[PDB]
DNA sequence: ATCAATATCCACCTGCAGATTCTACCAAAAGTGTATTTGGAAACTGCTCCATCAAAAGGCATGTTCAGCGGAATTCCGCTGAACATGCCTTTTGATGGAGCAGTTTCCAAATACACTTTTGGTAGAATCTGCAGGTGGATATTGAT
DNA sequence: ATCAATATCCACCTGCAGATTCTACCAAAAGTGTATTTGGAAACTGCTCCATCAAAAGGCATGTTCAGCGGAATTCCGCTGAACATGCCTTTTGATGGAGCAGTTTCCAAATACACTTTTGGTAGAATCTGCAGGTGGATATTGAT
């Protein structure tokens, strides 16, 4: 059973995302604040994605489902499956 | 022994990562987090691969974005280290609290 | 039997853009020039970004356009940047940009 | 259905020796269908705001003005008009 | 020039019988209804399209409500909705 | 009427008309207009109920835009649902950043 | 000059509704600039909705529709 | 000669204006600004009484909120005086620039 | 802690602008009954691709040590905004033509709707082509110690 | 500025993977061509409600004084970045069964399509009514000073 997979987003991966974000120096508290932010972000897209899946009486979340979900949030994504 | 002063490798890595475009989060770990959050919302749910990839594309896009704004609040503060309150300010003004 | 796309002098499918305007249920009726004008705009819009993507690629010694090229082309253009200010081009990266106060030394 | 072959023509038109990857073509497809839906909807709406049951080259033009930034809109209006005018006198 | 103003007035009374409402207030309530109507209609329209369907039925209306309204608000809005349909059907 | 058939103050028949003339779809089922109307009555009720309270609270009987504003923003959910809506003549909630108050 | 028509007292008042206690001198010309860029975006879209209808009169609905597209939905003037 | 101290009257003004709902900008100077900007878009225009109201209602509403975020950006930087750069940052983080 | 100036809160008074009550007219709903059409669920099922188990290997996460430096907190100072009383220049308010915003009638260019015939973009099947990913190496910067 | 340690650069070189290449099938498009319907431009017109302007009125500009705030320079203690050793778990290459998506045909409950009869929610003219916003009195909380 899947539990605590939020820790699967390693300090290293969060450090790399910040470099792209152009961040030079990071505080120790940042990593946990970020898991939180990423957690909420995902709970929101997947809820919607899954809501779309259910309405089509399917059992598989398709990329379209994620794509429609993102559009509903003003985070339109190009190029997907 | 040779040793770069603190922050040199960091600039090195900003330059580095801003040139590439590969996802910076381990795949399998991320997929688990997706499956977890999904199944603690509904069951018997399968995922197209590309579906988990769209979600990673978006998440990283979202986080890198957040980090630039966060990095800006810090410089406004005359700091170079993004702190939690920076993310909070950014997130708020961004319209996710506020 | 000339296509409408050629009648209009376009690469883009006027007949197709006309169907989609019906299946999209946007209004009771669709004028004849509606699809013609719209495929004209869509063609114009894709030629504009491709012009830029292609350049980005030349500047990258690459012959084939890839997502980062579309990304670099879109973010470097004021107007495309605004038109897609809420679109995320997957596998595109970001624009190299490091705040000044971060660089070392002085002057 | 895709816009791929059409994107390819134009592509070859601007850059005769350049190719496009599939992901890139994929994003170019997403792009087209996106602009297509915004202009459509802006048009659709405009008509209802005017108690008009028909979308025409005139709603499309306004939609294009409301949706596209500065210099792009100007040029897009031309292209649209030019094409309508041409197709108009061809039959 | 239609407006939900009279129906708004009805509802008001069932909730605050002694309470009245100024014009400007009543106009805001009108925009408010028109707004959610469009937001709900649109999402439903959209849902039918993604599923290549021709009809916007209450199933559509329902899901859209789940997508648009905040949790608990959505909870009741669904019940309310479901109840209204049940009543309408179970009627000669 | 249909509203009466479904037990509602809102105009089911009208809502139905508006769903057709709205070009939202080729066809409109019979429940949709009923279900939707139910939700508009309910949402309407929720806001009026809170704003009525806001009026009693300020010692007034007739509700004004300011009472719609106060009911909306002082409510996590409705405030979310109207997060990008500006209510004319509503004003803002009374709020002062603590750090700006005189040093007691 | 009209933009200068938006006065310091008026601007200082707005800021107060925003819970602002102390206002730097440079904020006023900065402010008018925001407002200028604001109106321009809205008014253009409204004037456009105006012309589409072939009117020589901007109607409050043309502003409401404008605002809706800017993502600034405004309840009070219909719709 | 009793005199109030810096910020005491302002604070009382905050209180004051957060209760009222009226426009804080005078109608005429504003109508003039709206008209001049419109003129650059289409000449010989006439504005409905309500159209100008809406625009004003929206502008103050807009400006007011921009002020709350600025105040927050000032406070984030251990200040209490909202400065230009404080507005600058807010608008950048709202996408009004990026 | 002690006055002394102001501001703020409150119980009450009352004209009036705007909310309410009443009648009447009415086209445009919205309800209702007939009968013709159809979307999409149900039932069978082909077939894509999702999950998942297996294994070998190094790309990378983890955890530790060390010290450079950046953030936090304290002090100090010049300059900048807040508060005020003076003063009048502009906005505000109530009135009066006429310009267009709409309500209505006309009628033709243009959009269904239907039946065919024709051209095509999608494609799955196989197979030849090619841009660059990624590995190598060694000449040119970038850095940091002295 | 010199010098040793490292990283960055970049042009040459080879190989798999993904792209450009065809043969033919072709349902579903898109085109062509009467026949029948109609939406909305176009010209005419009355009624609002908008632009203009006069003069009653309610704020704003202006100069002064100074309190206190932001910017600057300083100090120091702790926490984050660099460098390193170690070893695990992710990535990769493959294969298998079976779920559950998506295709195809059947076919009735539900929906569009008039057509007829009833009701009703919007408007316009008129009179009645009433919730509260400004207005006053007077007590009392708040603030700034000595």
Q: Which nucleotides of J are covered by protein (CB under 7 A)?
A: 5-8, 11, 18-20, 29-32, 39-41, 49-51, 59-61, 67-71, 79-84, 89-91, 99-102, 110-112, 120-123, 131-133, 143-145
Lookup: tokens for D28? 């170019």
CA-to-CA separations, C72 to B68, C48, C49, in angstroms, rounded: 17, 14, 10
Q: Out of 3.30.70.2190, 3.40.50.300, 1.10.20.10, 2.60.40.10, which CATH number does the structure's domain B1-98 have? A: 1.10.20.10
- Measure G76 CA to nearest chain F CA, in Å: 6
Separation between Cα atoms, residue E50 and residue H89, nearest integer Å = 39
Separation between Cα atoms, residue D78 and residue E5, nearest integer Å = 45
Cβ of A24 under 8 Å from any chain C Cβ?
yes
Separation between Cα atoms, residue H5 and residue B75, nearest integer Å = 33
Separation between Cα atoms, residue F34 and residue F30, nearest integer Å = 7
**Contacts of C17 by beta carbon, 8 Å cutoff, 6+ apart:** C35, C38, C39, C42, D36
Is 1.10.20.10 the CATH classification of the domain at F1-104?
A: yes
Counts for chain E of helices (H) and strands (E), in that order: 4, 2
Domain count of chain G? Answer: 1
Residues spanned by the domain of A33: 1-81
**Contacts of B21 by beta carbon, 8 Å cutoff, 6+ apart:** C67, C68, C71, C91, C92, C93
Separation between Cα atoms, residue E7 and residue F41, nearest integer Å = 8
The fourth-level CATH superfamily of domain C1-107 is Histone, subunit A (1.10.20.10)
Q: What DSSP element (H or E) covers A78?
A: strand A76-78
Separation between Cα atoms, residue B25 and residue F92, nearest integer Å = 42
The chains found to touch H (3+ Cβ pairs under 8 angstroms) are B, F, G
The secondary structure of residue B93, as a DSSP letter, is I
Neighbours of B2 (CB within 10 A): 3
Neighbours of B37 (CB within 10 A): 21
Lookup: tokens for F53? 């309270």
Separation between Cα atoms, residue H36 and residue C19, nearest integer Å = 43
- Measure G69 CA to nearest chain D CA, in Å: 9
Q: Which residues pair with D20 in a beta bridge?
A: C65
The secondary structure of residue F92, as a DSSP letter, is -
Resolution in A: 3.0
Is there a contact between E50 and A56 (Cβ–Cβ < 8 Å)? yes
Is there a contact between G30 and H84 (Cβ–Cβ < 8 Å)? yes
CA-to-CA separations, H67 to A19, H29, H56, H72, H89, in angstroms, rounded: 31, 21, 16, 9, 12
CA-to-CA separations, B88 to B97, F7, F53, in angstroms, rounded: 9, 47, 33
SS3 label, residue G5: helix
The vertex-D83 CA angle with D77 and D89, nearest 5°, equals 135
Is there a contact between D25 and C64 (Cβ–Cβ < 8 Å)? no
Q: How many residues does chain B have?
A: 98
The fourth-level CATH superfamily of domain D1-91 is Histone, subunit A (1.10.20.10)
CA-to-CA separations, E55 to A57, E61, F6, F30, F44, in angstroms, rounded: 16, 11, 21, 10, 26
Nearest to F103 by CA among H72, G21, E21: G21
Lookup: tokens for H82? 């909202």
The vertex-A42 CA angle with A39 and A45, nearest 5°, equals 155
Chain E residues close to C25, C-beta within 8 Å: 45, 49
Neighbours of H47 (CB within 10 A): 22
The secondary structure of residue C12, as a DSSP letter, is S
Helix spans in F22-103 (H): 32-57, 65-73, 76-81
Lookup: tokens for C96? 């190299």
Separation between Cα atoms, residue B94 and residue H96, nearest integer Å = 11
The secondary structure of residue C60, as a DSSP letter, is T
Inter-helix orientation angle D57-67/D70-88, to 10°: 170
The secondary structure of residue C4, as a DSSP letter, is H
Count residue pairs from C and D with Cβ separation < 8 A.
189
Neighbours of F49 (CB within 10 A): 17
CA-to-CA separations, G37 to C76, G11, G31, H97, in angstroms, rounded: 22, 16, 10, 11
Is 1.10.10.10 the CATH classification of the domain at E1-92?
A: no
Residue in A with minimal Cα distance to E71: A47
Residues of F with CB under 8 A from a CB of G: 65, 84-89, 91-92, 95-97, 100
Is there a contact between H51 and G63 (Cβ–Cβ < 8 Å)? yes
DSSP calls for E36-74: HHHHHHHHHHHHHHHTT-SEE-HHHHHHHHHHHS-HHHH
Lookup: tokens for D54? 């028909």
Is there a contact between H18 and F91 (Cβ–Cβ < 8 Å)? yes
Counts for chain D of helices (H) and strands (E), in that order: 4, 2
Structure-determination approach? X-ray
Nearest to F38 by CA among E9, A51, E37, E46: E37
DSSP calls for G6-73: S-HHHHHHHHHHTT--EE-TTHHHHHHHHHHHHHHHHHHHHHHHHHHTT-SEE-HHHHHHHHHHHT--
Lookup: tokens for B26? 């381990």
Q: Which residues pair with B46 in a beta bridge?
A: A60
Cβ of B23 under 8 Å from any chain A Cβ?
no
Is there a contact between B36 and A44 (Cβ–Cβ < 8 Å)? no
Q: Which nucleotides of I are covered by protein (CB under 7 A)?
A: 4-8, 18-20, 29-31, 39-41, 49-51, 60-62, 68-72, 80-85, 90-92, 99-102, 110-112, 118-122, 131-133, 143-145
Separation between Cα atoms, residue E16 and residue E11, nearest integer Å = 9
Please state the domain extents for chain H: 1-98
């Amino acid at each position: 059973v899947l539990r605590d997979n939020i820790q699967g987003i390693t300090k290293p991966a969060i450090r790399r995302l910040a470099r792209r974000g152009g961040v030079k120096r990071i505080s120790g508290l940042i990593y946990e604040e970020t898991r939180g932010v990423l957690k909420v972000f995902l709970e929101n897209v997947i809820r919607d994605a899954v809501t779309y899946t259910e309405h089509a009486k399917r059992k598989t979340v398709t990329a379209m489902d994620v794509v429609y979900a993102l559009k509903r949030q003003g985070r339109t994504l190009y190029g997907f499956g | 022994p040779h040793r770069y002063r603190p922050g040199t490798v960091a600039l090195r890595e900003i330059r580095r990562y801003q040139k590439s475009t590969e996802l910076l989060i381990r795949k399998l770990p991320f997929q688990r987090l997706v499956r977890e959050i999904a199944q603690d919302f509904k069951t018997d749910l399968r995922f197209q691969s590309s579906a988990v990839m769209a979600l990673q594309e978006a998440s990283e896009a979202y986080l890198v974005a957040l980090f630039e704004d966060t990095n800006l609040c810090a410089i406004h503060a005359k700091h170079v280290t993004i702190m939690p309150k920076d993310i909070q300010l950014a997130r708020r003004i961004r319209g996710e609290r506020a | 039997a000339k296509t409408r796309s050629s009648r209009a002098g376009l690469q883009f499918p006027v007949g197709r853009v006309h169907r989609l305007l019906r299946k999209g249920n946007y209004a009771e009726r669709v004028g004849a020039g509606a699809p013609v004008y719209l495929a004209a705009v869509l063609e114009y819009l894709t030629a504009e970004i491709l012009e830029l993507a292609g350049n980005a690629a030349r500047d990258n010694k690459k012959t084939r356009i890839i997502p980062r090229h579309l990304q670099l082309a879109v973010r470097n253009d004021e107007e495309l940047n605004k038109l897609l200010g809420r679109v995320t081009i997957a596998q595109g990266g970001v624009l190299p940009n490091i705040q000044s106060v971060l660089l070392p030394k002085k002057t | 259905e895709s816009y791929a072959i059409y994107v390819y023509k134009v592509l070859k038109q601007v850059h005769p020796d350049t190719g496009i990857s599939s992901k890139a073509m994929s994003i170019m497809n997403s792009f087209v269908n996106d602009v297509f839906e915004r202009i459509a909807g802006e048009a659709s709406r405009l008509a209802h705001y005017n108690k008009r049951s028909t979308i025409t080259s005139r709603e499309i033009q306004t939609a294009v003005r409301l949706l596209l930034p500065g210099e792009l809109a100007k040029h897009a209006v031309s292209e649209g008009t030019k094409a309508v005018t041409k197709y108009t006198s061809a039959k």
